[PDB]
Amino acid sequence: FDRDRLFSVVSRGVPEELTGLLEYLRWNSKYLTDSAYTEGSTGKTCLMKAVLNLQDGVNACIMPLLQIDKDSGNPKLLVNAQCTDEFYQGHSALHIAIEKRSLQCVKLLVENGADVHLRACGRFFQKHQGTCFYFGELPLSLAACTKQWDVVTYLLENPHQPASLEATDSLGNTVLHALVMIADNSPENSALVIHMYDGLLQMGARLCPTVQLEEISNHQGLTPLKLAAKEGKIEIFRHILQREFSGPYQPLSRKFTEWCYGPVRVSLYDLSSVDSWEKNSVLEIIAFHCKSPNRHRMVVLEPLNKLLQEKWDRLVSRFFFNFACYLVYMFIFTVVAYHQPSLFGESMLLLGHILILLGGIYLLLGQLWYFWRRRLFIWISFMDSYFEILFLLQALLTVLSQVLRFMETEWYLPLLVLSLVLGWLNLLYYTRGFQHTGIYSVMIQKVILRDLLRFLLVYLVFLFGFAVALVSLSREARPYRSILDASLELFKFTIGMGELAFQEQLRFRGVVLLLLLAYVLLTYVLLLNMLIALMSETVNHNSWSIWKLQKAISVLEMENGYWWCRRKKHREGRLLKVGTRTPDERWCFRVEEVNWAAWEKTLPTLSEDPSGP
């Protein structure tokens, strides 16, 4: 009565040919969970094979097989068996029952003591590149990621094996963490995730009211709101930040409404682990800890837009103070560089050099502190952490040249000149303090830069080839004597000073003239192609939110103060009671809106009378 007979009978669903299993299993002193009955080396047992194929969502061979397993006296229950291989490990029969969309089969296996909390920590179930489907490796989370309400409802309210809605996996994720973790920006997936996130939250309100499901963290220490912020999932991010529920499911809401007066409404959004008072807030995670193209999209959404606007309006005085200090430092640095000696006035110049050294050391120490605090931010996003790099570079140059002034060498003046030039190019950072120049500064490094690099590559190839050509062709006599000189003469065609003459001094002069004309034609092809491609990229246009992301990065660095003094940090919003959960006091942000179409006074309000900020 070999294993292939079992795996052929259970592939057909016939219960009559299961006769002879109990008698042979008792006679041979074997077990149905043994490796002899295992389907191959993958680890698959007989019941998972019977579950894997079904006749109209039900099998007549599952319950007799479970009866045989019960009558066989197995020390280890077969319904709790796991595959235990390299790729497909921990996958139990309850997971397959949930997969095949058979609620009746799930009920049939859970009636006989199937363990609900079975982690499937195989390679297929872990999130990695290649082939995988991560869902939190739990049957509760598997039903939560399948868009099934009956199965999760039965699992959470069954009397035999109740399913705890909070349950850590090997990565530390819960069912909410797993539901956040697999999410797209697509309308089909986002509606699924949002609706059943709400459903699981409202279920946990009346199933486990003692614990707070939202205020839980994984092994990385992130709540599902912070997990959505870090992973770039914006569709659930807005819904979590903006959810309002009317009725008994009130405390698990974040967009409370304080008062209404005709068309004007004052509503309080929640700032729980959102404002910068927390060490790992959502704003810091979005600005610094998130590697996703949807970063600027996550900044201009309420209530983050108005909160960051308030923070910028409070810190703009320090922003312009830093601007004025940097401008004064560059004025002093320009005056001293203008009055350099040949390589009262001497004492003043020495004091100026001392001030330059002090400012350079200050800038270097501040930039080194920033790089120590934000070491991963460079690898995450180069286009948001490059001025600081420049603010490092010239700064050490500002030190380095002075060192070459101490040694009294030749090269202290070119380093000072490059420091001056890079310092004046570093003044464009503070142009993000105004809206028009802030939108202007986005285009100067984002879209034009890649086109300029590819254009420079092609132009440098053409320039070098043509320069070698005119150098080699002009040596024979009847202009161009070196590669640098010929490249300088050929580069002047782009600036309007290209010399084009019929030189009657070379043995091959018509060839040189034709070659110059060909260079002019191909150069105009390159410039025209760059212009057309950049127009085409621009006309198919975002930049406003990218500027707002630069504003959010700017203010979050300013709330940390300078490297030498740590400023006091202030809480945003007010601590107000939102309900009797005994009081439920939350820190909240006041947002005012005007709606001329919402004329229904159905939802309750926290305050009966209007009040000011």
Residues 313 and 319: their CA atoms lie apart, in Å, by: 10
Q: Using the rule CB under 6 A, give the single segment among 135-143, 303-311, 318-326, 589-597 that binds ligand PEX.
A: 318-326
Q: Which of 180, 192, 293, 182 is nearest to 241 (CA)?
A: 180
Residue selected from 325, 484, 500, 525 as contacting ligand PEX according to rule CB under 6 A: 325
Tell which positions 77-116 bind a second copy, by CB under 8 A. 87-88, 100-101
Q: What is the DSSP letter of 506?
A: B
Residues 524 and 511: their CA atoms lie apart, in Å, by: 20
Tokens standing for 455? 């254009």
Residues 494 and 487: their CA atoms lie apart, in Å, by: 12
Tokens standing for 550? 């630069």
Q: How many residues bind ligand PEX (CB under 6 A)?
A: 13
Tell which positions 452-491 bind a second copy, by CB under 8 A. 452, 484-485, 488, 491
CB of 610 to ligand PEX, least distance (A): 41
Which residues have a C–N gap over 2.5 Å right after them in the chain?
343, 478, 541, 581
Residue selected from 326, 466, 519, 589 as contacting ligand PEX according to rule CB under 6 A: 326
53 binds a second copy (CB under 8 A): yes
- Burial call 331-348: b when 16+ CB within 10 Å, e when fewer: eebeebbeeeeeeeeeee
By C-beta, is 427 or 528 nearer to ligand PEX? 427
Q: Which residues 6+ apart lie within 8 Å of 195 measured at CB?
A: none
By C-beta, is 358 or 421 nearer to ligand PEX? 358
Residue 260's H or E segment, with its range, is strand 256-261
130 binds a second copy (CB under 8 A): yes
By C-beta, is 232 or 359 nearer to ligand PEX? 359
CB of 52 to a second copy, least distance (A): 5
145 binds a second copy (CB under 8 A): yes
Partner from a second copy, ligand PEX, none binding residue 606, C-beta < 5-8 Å depending on class: none
By C-beta, is 320 or 434 nearer to a second copy? 434
423 binds ligand PEX (CB under 6 A): no
597 binds a second copy (CB under 8 A): yes
Residue 591's H or E segment, with its range, is strand 584-594
535 binds a second copy (CB under 8 A): yes
Question: Hey, which residues does 590 pair with through a beta bridge?
Answer: 268
**Secondary structure (3-state) at 577:** strand
Tokens standing for 261? 């007066």
Asked if 22 and 71 count as a contact pair (C-beta separation under 8 A), the reply is yes
Residues 122 and 82: their CA atoms lie apart, in Å, by: 10
Q: What is the DSSP letter of 411?
A: T
Extended strands (E) in 115-209: none
369 binds ligand PEX (CB under 6 A): no
Q: Using the rule CB under 6 A, give the single segment among 220-228, 239-247, 320-328, 403-411 that binds ligand PEX.
A: 320-328
Residue selected from 125, 135, 429, 519 as contacting ligand PEX according to rule CB under 6 A: 429
By C-beta, is 83 or 283 nearer to a second copy? 83
Tell which positions 69-128 bind ligand PEX, by CB under 6 A. none
Q: Using the rule CB under 8 A, give the single segment among 217-225, 298-306, 322-330, 497-505 that binds a second copy.
A: 497-505
Q: Using the rule CB under 6 A, give the single segment among 158-166, 288-296, 319-327, 478-486 that binds ligand PEX.
A: 319-327
391 binds ligand PEX (CB under 6 A): yes
**Secondary structure (3-state) at 397:** helix
The contact set with ligand PEX (CB under 6 A) reads 322, 325-326, 328-329, 358-359, 362-363, 387-388, 391, 429
